Amino acid sequence: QDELDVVMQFDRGYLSPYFINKPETGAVELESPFILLADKKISNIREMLPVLEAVAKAGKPLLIIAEDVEGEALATLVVNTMRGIVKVAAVKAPGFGDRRKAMLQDIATLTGGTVISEEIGMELEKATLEDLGQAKRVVINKDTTTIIDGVGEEAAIQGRVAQIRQQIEEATSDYDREKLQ
Amino acid sequence: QDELDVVMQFDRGYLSPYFINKPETGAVELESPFILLADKKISNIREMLPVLEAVAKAGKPLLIIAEDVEGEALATLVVNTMRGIVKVAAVKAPGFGDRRKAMLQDIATLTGGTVISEEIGMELEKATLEDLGQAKRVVINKDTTTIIDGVGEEAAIQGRVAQIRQQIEEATSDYDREKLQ
Amino acid sequence: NIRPLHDRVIVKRKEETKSAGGIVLTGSAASTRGEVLAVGNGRILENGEVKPLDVKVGDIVIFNDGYGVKSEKIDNEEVLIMSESDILAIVE
Amino acid sequence: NIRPLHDRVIVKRKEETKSAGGIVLTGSAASTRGEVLAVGNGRILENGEVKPLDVKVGDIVIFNDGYGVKSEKIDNEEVLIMSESDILAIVEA
Amino acid sequence: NIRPLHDRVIVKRKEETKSAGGIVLTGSAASTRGEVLAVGNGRILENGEVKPLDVKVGDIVIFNDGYGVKSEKIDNEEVLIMSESDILAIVE
To answer: Where is the PTM N6-succinyllysine found along the chain (chains A, B)?
Structure first.
């Protein structure tokens, strides 16, 4: 028989299959977590230590949505949730090129976090709990990541929306209209 | 005529024919042993010393199920059981590629051990008795290795099973369904 | 116990797996400290004099794990034999 | 606090963010400066003499970040241990 | 017997075959101890003086098996000729 399922979500799974904290669904269910938005791709655990530290002494879990979580810095993150030191997830960023930074920014607004963009004069080490987004719940499986009900204020959200709404107005090409809406 | 046989087991024999501790059957019968699960392939005895040490001062035998046990690190292991310093078996890992790590993980769950995966930030030297699985008995011959009744808790097991049970649901190809069940 | 020749310090290394926070580091990220166990008389100079060492037996010392650092097996203890040149500091 | 052996300088690195004009440089364009925290007695010479160091505890010094520069973790502070050979200059007044 | 020149120590190696645990290592992994058999007078200094060695004939010594260590054949015995620089310690 027919069946309807309902949820913001994007097409990216966990990078580390050893994160699934509920083998029932085969998915990671991070309860009321922080969210780190890294524009650059991460390979060294050095950059994480400052922020990872403040999350470890806060109790709450953490989702890491960067361009990529490379082995050296991935390997570690695993053994840390492996043991229960911090509860962390790693997922690639939604998109490619300028659309990624644009979409990555959308997430910051919904969650009340700052995009830690290496290009516009920010180091990943100089981030604090300040710059992290927050959500009510997070759900990630092999294929998709879902942020349920972010902390971001609806003023900032609808401001960000009426901006993207007028980006679709100046879209002279159909393709520029698709991905915007 | 028809024939019924009853028995976890996988298609791998001993790597070292000089391990057979019962020349009656031509097979190794390790009584109530520890189990080391190495993702990487082993060639140097250096990596083993830390864990081999703790097993040598524990009295119990040890099964080593890594990607491979290379000569330099194999040679030694032999002369050690040869004499009676430690009782150790070496067998290749069941499978190839991502299926191997998946299957190697299944064994960890049945035995209550940790997969010492070099890729996700673990050295083989930093393993302890902690990370070793355990079983009631182990039987290995020229062709197959059998773990009889592992220490792993049936909670973790059936959790791991209901996970693999839903992996067969998303199997869109027949072949992906075969090896999973 | 061991004896050191000329200027050699015998040290035993310590530890850590974790960092600043307890966040466990990977074996790309994660020792250079150790304890002095035995000390040689000193270097012998061109004028025949023997310069004593500034490290006493039982200092916590920070050393450079260079080329000149060698490894030994003593009573089944992991020890190191290096020259005083390879010692950089003391923790008091 | 730490102690230096023979001739070793213990320094902590710094960073200005801005340039000639106030035009803020990016962390590709902008470190080789640091502050002295502890100093060893001196080098010991072939004649047995101990040459004192020309860097006092608390100089702003320009150093070469060579091979001989090693890193340490002290009270959770990033510090450096190098020989006086690796120090090139002092910034005074 | 053999004679050592300037500063040279003639030593014979022993075995260890085993490790940390007694777990016998293979001849890819496995010795740095030896016994002194003959000793040279000493190094000659720029002022003409001859500095005696601090190793007497018959010490159990820990040495660095460096580049300067050479091999010889004496009465069909495996012996080593190294400078005193390559000796690190004595076992007393």
So the answer is: 92, 136
| Of the options 2.60.120.580, 3.30.110.10, 2.60.40.720, 2.30.33.40, the CATH number for the domain spanning E1-92 | 2.30.33.40
Enumerate the domain spans of chain C. 1-92
Neighbouring chains to D with at least 3 Cβ pairs closer than 8 Å: A, C
Tell me which chain A residue has its CA closest to the CA of residue C28. A72
**CA–CA dist A94, A12 (Å, integer):** 7
- What's the CATH code, domain D1-93? 2.30.33.40
Look-up: residue for tokens 């530890």?
C15
Where do the H-state alpha helices sit in chain E? none
CB contact under 8 A, D24 and A123: no
Residue E71 CA from chain centroid, whole number: 11
> What is the rounded CA–CA span in Å between residue B67 and residue B64?
10
Short-list B97, B78, B99, B98, CA closest to B89: B78
Contact B76 E25 (CB under 8 A): yes
Residue of E nearest to C70 (CA): E64
CA separation, residue B22 to residues B10, B26, B27, E22, E53 (Å): 20, 6, 6, 25, 59
Cβ contact C88–D3 (<8 Å): no
- Write the CA distances from A172 to A83, A160, A177, integer angstroms: 52, 21, 8
Strand partners, D77: D74
Between CA B137 and CA A176 the distance in angstroms is 64
- What is the interface size between A and B, counted as CB pairs within 8 Å? 28
Tell me how the structure was determined.
X-ray
D47 touches chain C (CB under 8 A): yes
Q: From residue B33, how far is each of A71, B62, D43, E38 by CA, in Å? A: 33, 5, 58, 52
Spatial separation of the C-alpha atoms in residues B86 and B53, rounded to whole Å:
9
In angstroms, this model's resolution equals: 3.6
